[PDB]
Design a protein around this ligand. Sequence first.
Ligand SMILES: *[C@H](CC(=O)CCC(=O)O)c1c(COP(=O)(O)O)cnc(C)c1O
Ligand SMILES: C=C(CCC(=O)O)/N=C/c1c(COP(=O)(O)O)cnc(C)c1O
Lengths: 421, 421
Amino acid sequence: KTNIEAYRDGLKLKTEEDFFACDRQYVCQNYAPVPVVISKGKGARVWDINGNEYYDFLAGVSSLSQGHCHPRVIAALCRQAERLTLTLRAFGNDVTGPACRFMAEMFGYDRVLLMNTGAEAGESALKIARKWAYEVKEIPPDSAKVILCNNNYWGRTITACSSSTTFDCYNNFGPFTPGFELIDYDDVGALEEALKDPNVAAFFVEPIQGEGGVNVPKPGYLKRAHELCRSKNVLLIVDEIQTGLCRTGRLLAADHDEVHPDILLLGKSLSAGVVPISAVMGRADVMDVLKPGTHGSTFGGNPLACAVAVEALTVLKDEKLADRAERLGAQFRDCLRRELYGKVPWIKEIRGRGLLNAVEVDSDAIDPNDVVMKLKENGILSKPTRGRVMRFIPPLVITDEEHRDATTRIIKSFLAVEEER
Amino acid sequence: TNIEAYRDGLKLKTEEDFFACDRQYVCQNYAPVPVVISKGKGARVWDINGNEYYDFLAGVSSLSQGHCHPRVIAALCRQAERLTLTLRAFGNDVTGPACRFMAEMFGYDRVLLMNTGAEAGESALKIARKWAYEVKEIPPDSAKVILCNNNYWGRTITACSSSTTFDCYNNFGPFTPGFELIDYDDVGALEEALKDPNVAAFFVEPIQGEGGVNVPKPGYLKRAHELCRSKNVLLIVDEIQTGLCRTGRLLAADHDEVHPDILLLGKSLSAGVVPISAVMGRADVMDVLKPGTHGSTFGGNPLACAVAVEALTVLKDEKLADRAERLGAQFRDCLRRELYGKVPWIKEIRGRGLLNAVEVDSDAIDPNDVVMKLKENGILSKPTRGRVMRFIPPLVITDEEHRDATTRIIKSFLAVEEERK
Ligand SMILES: *[C@H](CC(=O)CCC(=O)O)c1c(COP(=O)(O)O)cnc(C)c1O
Ligand SMILES: C=C(CCC(=O)O)/N=C/c1c(COP(=O)(O)O)cnc(C)c1O
């Protein structure tokens, strides 16, 4: 027994309520109450402390695309952990360079910056874009602007809160970092107007807004936005932290528009949910503005995380998970539309790409939480966003049989909430 | 594993094969490195050729427990086979107990777990600001945070906005407002800054780390806390580098009997295995972070929690604070006896526990000569500010290893003085 096991045994926590109580007393209260206490995970399934099985339809908001506890990923983690886990980038090691080359070739970029979290990747991208704009575009000192979209989500740092339109994200956290211009998402005309400001350094966008509600933009949005940006020598920063890595049926969601972002951000399933590792990738003349001493991170690029990420990325390609997500996701949306539209009137839209799907409900006709509990009653764990946006984000490794099963279970949940209404 | 297979395929034999790989594919934000490490164990590391060295950087105090500590690796691997990530959107059977473990060890009501040191600082600033607005009722957006010249807390834009280090902030603006910078180890300056009633907090290190292992005068922190209480100003103490037995005490703040209003931990909190940081505080302060007002994908993940509890246990079981205290005092006593006077270009020998530095006069010697000589003699070290040599070995360094190392360190400075003549 490891220390955490022995300490927990000592607390005599028997019921879920015992754990909830432990949360309320000792854990910062920055998350809402949970409906379950998970003890183990494997592939697309998880089990609570009572042995009840569920299908995880949140998957770390697309951090567990390879499934919980993927054997190859866990073996890569353990083998590297017995050898070397951290050197700092102050010293070299035999893993960091190779892992970056691996990523540079898979994604087609000259330089890779490894950080730890999604927020750090975003911060790093904003720093690169501002320094690039001052040094290469020669914009006046402190005048750089970055354009982003309403309802964007990229992190919880002060700079991220300073660029959010979500009240709870920014309220009472100021004063704020200046230099952001917010525009409506999926609106090329608004981007075109904002790009008239010659001090713009970058346009930072999600190919499909994640936390914003699985907001899928109109056809051509990202391609059109890239051209407008290029026309003005503005960097297009594409946040693929939630949408990349096969989640949408393509290696990158940007691929749906044949867009190669000027700066790409990856995170989440980059590690298959095993350890926090994020990446910022770009061409040499952009990324090289980060000279020695101008940026750093204690754990960024550590060898354990590099080993893990290389194995996690290989699983995506070896298990053909992009093909899997495209095939299963189309079947998911087709089955939900066929059995739910018309029959369940309070469903507003069934949308998504690949296995990044959402069912937005009308909160003035139904209580969204009822859907969430019925889903749970039927063995489906999910967490909505914005209250009314139900999300279906299972691991991509979910088998044909398990996905058929889960699909039936999800439909059964929506119809039972209707029959009950 | 995939990282090992891919590396072999690349046919990287020499240290230069790796330096080149690293130059071509890795973002170039770190200076050239002198070595290619392939294995770590305890206080020792080996390069790709089998050459052995004593690691005297230890992740800048992230590896206090040593490289690849068997118990920590075992805890990692046991938990990784079970469950690594649920998000705080769902409960698990590890996070709560781990936070309780930490709350009792450090004596706080609430524990917020983040991933990196930078995230811990960002989170503490958000708390202090939201607390200032909600509890002190200061005017909206007027919150000020006092910090010290040469502080280091991270690389987010907000951290760059509060830095006085040129490379950290240059060309990264516009900057987050709301910071008042004062000299470090200057109670008079703090007392003056505290007359502003919009101040929410004073954010400080017990010993400035990246700033050069700057040890303040006796009573600094005790005096600073009294001044802050008098003004209902929170004292945020950053123990990410100083904490966890490094200075001979559980927290460096203990030296002054100061219990920080907000404490920050990171680095050795995980024994350098995975990134996990913590922000701890009393209920009436931490509870301002209501549901939806702060978050993080990986923060509080169960794998990191399991690792942290084992890492923290190692500190106590192995009496690493006693070890650091004893060997530290010996290291400084030995260097001062053998080097002061004899080596005129040594400005000062300072530190607490095993957080020690030798500042050299860079106009009288090339500090890099000292670094390469140390390396030639089996000691890997990385200075800060060019001229501050740093000696920060894992606290698990044995009596013999430390005697041998000290001898080798003393020997290097003497060879450099010999050469000057
Ligand atoms: C992550 C979004 C989330 O799923 C947040 C969930 C939570 O519990 O906080 C995300 C980020 C931020 O990455 P982290 O800092 O959380 O690693 C950035 N960009 C996108 C598109 C995200 O989805
Ligand atoms: C060692 C470093 C930086 C090393 C590097 O970026 O290579 N300092 C980290 C640090 C930090 C930042 O932690 P990080 O974000 O690197 O985890 C915060 N506070 C204190 C007192 C610290 O010493």
